[PDB]
């Protein structure tokens, strides 16, 4: 009578021809093949953003733009004072190789290249200028321009740090300091160090102070290794060093 049992077993085998372990490893080689077909051609380029001041001289060299395969580059036009300056007109050679999404009155352009190693040129005419501006662009370099900020020598129609250090941005050229027993992040940049904490200093006197909306404290301070800090009825001494 075990004929039905053998039939049930072998029909389970015929119903499901795959081992569950085979299912797992077939999934593994499946996403492995997905990774292989989603691999990168060579090493990836370095993403870079640059600014450049353009040249309106009648003997200078027009700038060259690196084009990425399908990735959007934002080219933003500003005048000598840095004020916005929208473009009156624009035209590109070889319209198939590139894409343009140009908003109607912005001083910006968005460019998506399509072909791999075919280079072209672009010519624009500014709104407040008789002088046209021509750039060239090649694709397929090892550095890819996410944003190019172009500044015009001619003038257009139009012509802080406390916030940064409260938000958490240290000044450039600054270094950290070692403070004993204090919850203060200290940056020494230009012999007037900046202190970022949740405390109210008492002894040397604030020279410039900011209290945040959340309630943190930022102070400027001259160089002195010993401070006296009061905190809610407590008094202590802090050593700052490096």
């Amino acid at each position: 009578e075990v004929i039905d049992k053998k039939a049930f077993k072998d029909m389970t085998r015929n119903l499901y021809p795959l081992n569950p372990e085979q299912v797992v490893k077939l999934k593994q080689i499946y996403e492995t093949s997905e990774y292989a077909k989603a691999a990168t051609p060579g090493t990836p380029p370095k993403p870079t953003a640059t600014s450049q001041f353009v040249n309106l001289s009648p003997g200078s060299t027009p700038p060259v733009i690196r084009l990425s395969q399908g990735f959007v580059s934002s080219l933003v036009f500003l005048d000598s004072t840095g004020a916005p300056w929208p473009i009156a007109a624009y035209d590109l050679g070889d319209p198939s190789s590139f894409n343009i999404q140009w908003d109607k009155t912005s001083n910006t352009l968005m460019i998506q290249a399509t072909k791999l190693y075919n280079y072209g040129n672009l010519a624009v005419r500014l709104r407040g200028l008789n002088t046209p501006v021509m750039l060239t662009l090649i694709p397929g370099q090892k550095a890819v321009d996410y944003r190019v900020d172009l500044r015009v020598q001619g003038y257009g129609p139009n012509a802080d740090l406390l916030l940064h250090v409260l938000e958490g941005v240290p000044p450039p050229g600054s270094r950290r300091l070692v403070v004993s027993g204090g919850d203060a992040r200290a940056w020494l940049s230009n012999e007037k160090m900046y202190v970022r904490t949740n405390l109210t200093i008492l002894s040397p006197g604030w020279l410039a102070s900011m209290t945040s909306a959340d309630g943190t404290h930022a102070y400027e301070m001259q160089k002195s290794p010993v401070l006296l800090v009061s905190w809610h009825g407590k008094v202590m001494q802090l050593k700052v060093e490096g």
Binding site: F53, R66, I138, Q141, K142, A143
Partner: protein, 63 residues
């Protein structure tokens, strides 16, 4: 001594940017001041030979 880095590079033509913000484009047989001529301009691998034997490449940060 103004140091030139590769700004753009195709087969045939090359583009270099100096320390002062000046930029130029070089062929194979061309006069580069301070460095002379160009012996090879390898469009692949971002490598440029000079007549002084100097190898011009990109910046380390801008590579």
């Amino acid at each position: 001594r103004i140091i030139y880095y590769i700004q753009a590079v195709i087969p045939g033509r090359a583009w270099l940017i100096g320390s002062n913000g000046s930029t130029l484009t070089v062929r194979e047989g061309s006069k580069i001041p301070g460095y002379g001529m160009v012996k090879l301009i390898d469009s692949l691998q971002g490598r440029i030979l000079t007549s002084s034997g100097q190898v011009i490449k990109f910046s380390q940060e801008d590579s």
